[PDB]
Structures are given as structure tokens and as C-alpha cells.
């Protein structure tokens, strides 16, 4: 997990692409796995009581319900979240270009997985907040709503939602992103 | 008098406007510091494992 | 001082008695001086002045409205970023 999130995804913007489509495809890869990972995560009070396992003689904490870490990363200002938002803004602009094939199909599927993970976090967030509030990790989570009105770094203001809307302008060309967005 | 009030409210709105981007600037710098504290934490966790 | 240099030494030919009576009956003599009006074409003149001042008044009022609307949109934006 750390290998993928710190070394691959979070760096995917800093890597040089001889084939530009590669940046998009690699983001697509990382996203697919993170997505499936969260998609199975069921919030349980077991995740927030740090289970102690005797591994190699040292008591290490057992991993929580698989998505919990990802959720903690999405429920806080993690570079992961801002990267999601940045890919979002960049896709919005690229769409606004109304430009041919280059990296496209991968770009679409990427942003689509992103929207999917967003919907999933929103979906589970109710029970996840209930459980965390019941087991009390000092970890502070904010419901994804308040974060979505976040002030975008590039935009310098809360245009995450507005950008998210703007894809609705591209409906007649892209039905898929429109569906996800409206969801 | 409406000219007076509208200009003053313009000062007020511009003030709140810049203040929002500045508090967002602090919100960014603070997540930037939140990542380096995590870097120090990671090293501390590794030392504990050792 | 110019107010008293003008309002006295009576005007274009209105007799002084009516001039001093309109100076004394002046309501808001600081916000207005008695101006001579002649007949009905001067009433048309005052209606024209009222019309042009109405145009300017609507203009400056709409300017204040433009300032208001700008402050309002920027205020909504600031109050959005605050929560961020």
C-alpha cells in the first residue's frame, strides 16, 4: 500500500513520460487498486481498536478494515486528496480543450474511477463516522462535504464543485463523466 | 450616502475575499507541515521496529 | 459668502419685494437658493432639468448597485473559502 501510494501515485506527476498517455495510464492503474480496496471496506468497530499481534516477537497493530487507511487519507488533507482534486481540475481543463485522442480513453477511465471513489467515500462516510465516533481514534475526520467546498490550490477558491459541474457541459460528448458527476 | 455605503461594503468584501485566500494559504502550508511531521513519525516507527 | 453675493443684488428683473419674500420663505436655504422662473416655458425647463437629473440619478444608483453586486459575489466566494 505505502509502495503504491507514496512511491507511484503521489509521484506520478513528477515522472517523465516519453509517451504522455503513460502518466494517465499509471494513474489509472493506481486508482483501480485503491478503488477496489475501498469498495470492499466495511466500517466496523474492530478497525478502530488497535488489535495487537505478536509478529516477529514485537506487538504490532493489525491492519484495520482494508479501506480504513485510505479513508483516513481521504478524510484529511492528504496529498492523495489534493492529487485527486488536481487530476480533477486538469481533466476538466483538458476536456474544455475539446481535443482529440491523446491519452483520452485512459484519461476518461481515470477520472471516472476517481468519481467512483468519491461516491464510495460519501456512501460509507455515515457509518464510518458513526463507528469512529464510537471507538474514538483521536484522528479527526471531516465529512467529504466540507472538504469538497475546499479552496482549490490552482483556483485559489472553492471551485471544486463548480469544476465538477463543468463536466456536465461536456455531456453530449461524454455521457459517462456526466453520469458520475450528477451522481 | 449609498455611494458611501457601497464603497465601504466594497472594502469589506475585498477584505473578506483576500482573508479567505490567506486562510487557505495557511491551510496549505499546514498540510505541508503535516506531511513532514509524518516523515519524522515514519522514521520514529522504523526505530521502534528496530 | 458667494451665496449672499448672488441671492442679493436682486436677479434678472424680478422685483425686489418678491425676491426678499422668496428669500425669507426659503425652506432649506442652505440646500437651495431661490432661482427665478418665468412662466410656462420655464416650467418645461424645470421638467427638463428634473428629467436629466433623473437620468443621472438612475445612473449613479445603478453604479452603487454594481458595487453592491460585486461585493456580494466576492462575499459569497470569500465565505465559501473560509469553510475550506
PDB file of N, CA, C and O in Angstrom, chain A residues 74 118 121-122 125 142-150 160-161, chain C residues 83-84:
ATOM      1  N   UNK A  74      -8.410  10.111   2.874  1.00  0.00           N
ATOM      2  CA  UNK A  74      -9.387  10.949   2.191  1.00  0.00           C
ATOM      3  C   UNK A  74     -10.139  11.844   3.160  1.00  0.00           C
ATOM      4  O   UNK A  74     -10.637  12.901   2.761  1.00  0.00           O
ATOM      5  N   UNK A 118     -14.913   8.793  -4.922  1.00  0.00           N
ATOM      6  CA  UNK A 118     -15.581   9.877  -4.218  1.00  0.00           C
ATOM      7  C   UNK A 118     -16.964   9.450  -3.758  1.00  0.00           C
ATOM      8  O   UNK A 118     -17.330   9.629  -2.589  1.00  0.00           O
ATOM      9  N   UNK A 121     -16.642   6.999  -0.830  1.00  0.00           N
ATOM     10  CA  UNK A 121     -16.349   7.644   0.440  1.00  0.00           C
ATOM     11  C   UNK A 121     -17.595   8.305   0.994  1.00  0.00           C
ATOM     12  O   UNK A 121     -17.910   8.156   2.176  1.00  0.00           O
ATOM     13  N   UNK A 122     -18.330   9.020   0.146  1.00  0.00           N
ATOM     14  CA  UNK A 122     -19.574   9.622   0.604  1.00  0.00           C
ATOM     15  C   UNK A 122     -20.534   8.560   1.105  1.00  0.00           C
ATOM     16  O   UNK A 122     -21.205   8.745   2.125  1.00  0.00           O
ATOM     17  N   UNK A 125     -19.327   7.050   4.408  1.00  0.00           N
ATOM     18  CA  UNK A 125     -18.865   8.018   5.391  1.00  0.00           C
ATOM     19  C   UNK A 125     -19.791   8.092   6.588  1.00  0.00           C
ATOM     20  O   UNK A 125     -19.342   8.320   7.710  1.00  0.00           O
ATOM     21  N   UNK A 142     -13.131  14.836   8.546  1.00  0.00           N
ATOM     22  CA  UNK A 142     -14.170  15.775   8.171  1.00  0.00           C
ATOM     23  C   UNK A 142     -15.044  15.155   7.100  1.00  0.00           C
ATOM     24  O   UNK A 142     -14.512  14.562   6.151  1.00  0.00           O
ATOM     25  N   UNK A 143     -16.366  15.236   7.221  1.00  0.00           N
ATOM     26  CA  UNK A 143     -17.223  14.716   6.154  1.00  0.00           C
ATOM     27  C   UNK A 143     -16.816  15.310   4.818  1.00  0.00           C
ATOM     28  O   UNK A 143     -16.485  16.491   4.720  1.00  0.00           O
ATOM     29  N   UNK A 144     -16.819  14.465   3.787  1.00  0.00           N
ATOM     30  CA  UNK A 144     -16.276  14.876   2.498  1.00  0.00           C
ATOM     31  C   UNK A 144     -16.947  16.133   1.974  1.00  0.00           C
ATOM     32  O   UNK A 144     -16.379  16.829   1.129  1.00  0.00           O
ATOM     33  N   UNK A 145     -18.154  16.433   2.452  1.00  0.00           N
ATOM     34  CA  UNK A 145     -18.837  17.645   2.017  1.00  0.00           C
ATOM     35  C   UNK A 145     -17.973  18.874   2.241  1.00  0.00           C
ATOM     36  O   UNK A 145     -17.630  19.582   1.287  1.00  0.00           O
ATOM     37  N   UNK A 146     -17.607  19.143   3.493  1.00  0.00           N
ATOM     38  CA  UNK A 146     -16.841  20.346   3.790  1.00  0.00           C
ATOM     39  C   UNK A 146     -15.550  20.387   2.991  1.00  0.00           C
ATOM     40  O   UNK A 146     -15.118  21.458   2.553  1.00  0.00           O
ATOM     41  N   UNK A 147     -14.914  19.238   2.802  1.00  0.00           N
ATOM     42  CA  UNK A 147     -13.692  19.213   2.013  1.00  0.00           C
ATOM     43  C   UNK A 147     -13.963  19.597   0.566  1.00  0.00           C
ATOM     44  O   UNK A 147     -13.156  20.293  -0.057  1.00  0.00           O
ATOM     45  N   UNK A 148     -15.087  19.144   0.011  1.00  0.00           N
ATOM     46  CA  UNK A 148     -15.374  19.416  -1.389  1.00  0.00           C
ATOM     47  C   UNK A 148     -15.488  20.903  -1.665  1.00  0.00           C
ATOM     48  O   UNK A 148     -15.041  21.363  -2.717  1.00  0.00           O
ATOM     49  N   UNK A 149     -16.047  21.663  -0.736  1.00  0.00           N
ATOM     50  CA  UNK A 149     -16.032  23.110  -0.831  1.00  0.00           C
ATOM     51  C   UNK A 149     -14.666  23.683  -0.515  1.00  0.00           C
ATOM     52  O   UNK A 149     -14.556  24.889  -0.294  1.00  0.00           O
ATOM     53  N   UNK A 150     -13.639  22.844  -0.453  1.00  0.00           N
ATOM     54  CA  UNK A 150     -12.296  23.316  -0.209  1.00  0.00           C
ATOM     55  C   UNK A 150     -11.868  24.352  -1.224  1.00  0.00           C
ATOM     56  O   UNK A 150     -12.380  24.432  -2.337  1.00  0.00           O
ATOM     57  N   UNK A 160     -13.953  23.459  -6.644  1.00  0.00           N
ATOM     58  CA  UNK A 160     -14.007  22.018  -6.829  1.00  0.00           C
ATOM     59  C   UNK A 160     -15.379  21.589  -7.312  1.00  0.00           C
ATOM     60  O   UNK A 160     -15.501  20.860  -8.300  1.00  0.00           O
ATOM     61  N   UNK A 161     -16.429  22.047  -6.638  1.00  0.00           N
ATOM     62  CA  UNK A 161     -17.776  21.689  -7.055  1.00  0.00           C
ATOM     63  C   UNK A 161     -18.102  22.307  -8.406  1.00  0.00           C
ATOM     64  O   UNK A 161     -18.739  21.676  -9.254  1.00  0.00           O
TER      65      UNK A 161
ATOM     66  N   UNK C  83     -14.711  28.297   4.828  1.00  0.00           N
ATOM     67  CA  UNK C  83     -15.011  26.959   5.319  1.00  0.00           C
ATOM     68  C   UNK C  83     -13.992  25.932   4.868  1.00  0.00           C
ATOM     69  O   UNK C  83     -13.655  25.004   5.609  1.00  0.00           O
ATOM     70  N   UNK C  84     -13.528  26.057   3.629  1.00  0.00           N
ATOM     71  CA  UNK C  84     -12.352  25.321   3.197  1.00  0.00           C
ATOM     72  C   UNK C  84     -11.233  25.434   4.215  1.00  0.00           C
ATOM     73  O   UNK C  84     -10.713  24.420   4.704  1.00  0.00           O
TER      74      UNK C  84
END
